[PDB]
């Protein structure tokens, strides 16, 4: 009630934090062949949501795996290969992970400014009539 801006800016901070964690996992598991062909790691992405029934908070609605086909590689030497000597690798694209890293960091720090400036307006309100 007295801190509506904080609940929205703070929600963005929590929302954008999850997207950076997801990006870190995608880049750290870009070369994890693992085993089989369906347990292989796939690029994960958070889903943001806004319920507009004032302020509309941003809520993460779960992590969703990418629909891109797995990157196939011919390697009849890896013991975890298949009949045709193929090892399927995660469908992680480095260029899209770099862009998400730039977008997440900048958007996260933008909400810091709004939340920090929101406190100043509250502090100035207490000085009304003084």
């Amino acid at each position: 009630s007295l801190f509506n801006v904080f609940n929205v800016t703070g929600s963005a901070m929590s929302a954008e934090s999850v997207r950076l964690n997801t990006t870190s996992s995608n880049l750290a598991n870009a070369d994890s062949v693992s085993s089989s062909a369906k347990d292989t790691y796939k690029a994960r992405h958070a889903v943001f949501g806004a319920e507009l029934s004032d302020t509309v908070p941003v809520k993460v609605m779960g992590i969703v795996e990418s629909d891109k086909p797995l990157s196939a590689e011919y390697n009849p030497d890896h013991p975890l290969a298949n009949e045709e000597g193929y090892i399927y690798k995660p469908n992680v694209n480095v260029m899209e992970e770099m862009a998400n890293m730039i977008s997440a960091s900048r958007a996260y720090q933008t909400n810091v400014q709004v939340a920090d400036s929101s406190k100043q307006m509250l502090l100035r309100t207490l000085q009304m009539g003084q």
Partner: protein
């Protein structure tokens, strides 16, 4: 449902209202005391 603006406005309105009624009460009493202390 309430904000700091409403709280501060409520605080300021109460302070002005309280200061108004005290001074007028003070003025009337001083007027009464002046009338009582006069040479008949």
């Amino acid at each position: 449902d309430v904000s700091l603006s409403d709280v501060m406005i409520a605080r300021n309105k109460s302070s002005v209202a309280f200061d108004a009624t005290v001074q007028i009460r003070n003025k009337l009493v001083e007027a009464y005391k002046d009338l009582m202390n006069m040479p008949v």
